[PDB]
Amino acid sequence: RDVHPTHYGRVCPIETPEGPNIGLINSLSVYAQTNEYGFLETPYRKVTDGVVTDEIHYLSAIEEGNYVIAQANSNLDEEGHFVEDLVTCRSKGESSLFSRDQVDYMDVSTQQVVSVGASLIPFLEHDDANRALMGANMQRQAVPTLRADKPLVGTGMERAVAVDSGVTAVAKRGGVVQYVDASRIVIKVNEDEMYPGEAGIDIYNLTKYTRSNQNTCINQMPCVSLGEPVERGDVLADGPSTDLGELA
């Protein structure tokens, strides 16, 4: 039930149940994926000479223990070279300071260690770890209200969470909106891309007030008004606790 030093880019160290199941249940990090054999991998940026390139390798637990991995909070130059000749790094389950030429891999982003639930806590680094855990646990118990209200201060992950949860309505191949109703959205697809023969339009049937698993309400309201040009991947209707395609 402890945080092994290999939980860096694979398993969230913050979000976990409190009383009986602490450490026995975990959440995948934002960038963590599964290897072909079934082991957790995390992305990193290759380092050639002293310039950090944009090419990306997914490293597993065994592989990342040999290379020296740089830090996300390492300042760079215009050409990509390290500004400082000395950079903090992790070599083998530890943390030390190495020259700019001994760096093998670079952390892709500052969110790599933090899962989805803890990624929506602004100023997370200013909060105690246990209180951050409490906040991450409690964020998942909130219920949708009458009107969704955007967070005046967020972390930029609200859009990704809202869109990727399937709670909203996303235009698969939307063009210009033809008809908007409180329960239907009809979009006339642009002529630039089309399926030959029979033409066709996109119809979305919004789900109105519907009982959830926790006896809460599920409702969807449109964002588009009429004749609004909608691109592919746009948000048409926001589900419960979502404002303009942003988690709220």
């Binding site: 500052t110 909130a142 005046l152 201060v153």
Partner: protein, 149 residues
């Protein structure tokens, strides 16, 4: 004010994110109030666009390149009408806004730099001796209600 919270919960729980978020939400709502006030008088779109541009470019080497020059006039009007409640900023997790950036944002919106204002008692009308940190915080209604308890 809408919610009154006990300060004593902060120094013992080490929830400094509480205070930082309240200050920064106060700054965001101040920007929104400035935009709403400018929208009230129906001034020319050029000066509102200039204010929005000045507000968006604030920061210390921020990787945000939003520009209103390539933004349609009607689009600028609609954007300014959408964020009249408050400027919905986004601070990422481990690289977020610093205290200097929050304070300069507060200065932009004609708000105190320290983030604390003079509060008067609603019942007696007497000013409290110390300034109180009034801000905007995102509160959640958890699923533990007494109707089921």
């Amino acid at each position: 004010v809408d919610i009154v919270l006990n300060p004593l919960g902060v120094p013992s729980r080490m929830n400094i994110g509480q205070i930082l978020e309240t200050h920064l939400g106060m700054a965001a709502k101040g920007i929104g109030d400035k935009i709403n006030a400018m929208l009230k008088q129906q001034q020319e779109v050029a000066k509102l666009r200039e204010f929005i541009q000045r507000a968006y470019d604030l920061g210390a080497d921020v990787r945000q390149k939003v520009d209103l020059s390539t933004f349609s006039d009607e689009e600028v009007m609609r954007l300014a009408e959408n964020l009249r409640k408050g400027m919905p900023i986004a601070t990422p997790v481990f690289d977020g806004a610093k205290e200097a950036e929050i304070k300069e944002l507060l200065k932009l919106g004609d708000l105190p730099t320290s983030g604390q204002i003079r509060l008067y008692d609603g019942r007696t009308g007497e000013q409290f001796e110390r300034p109180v940190t009034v801000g905007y915080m995102y509160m959640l209604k958890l699923n533990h209600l007494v109707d089921d308890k």
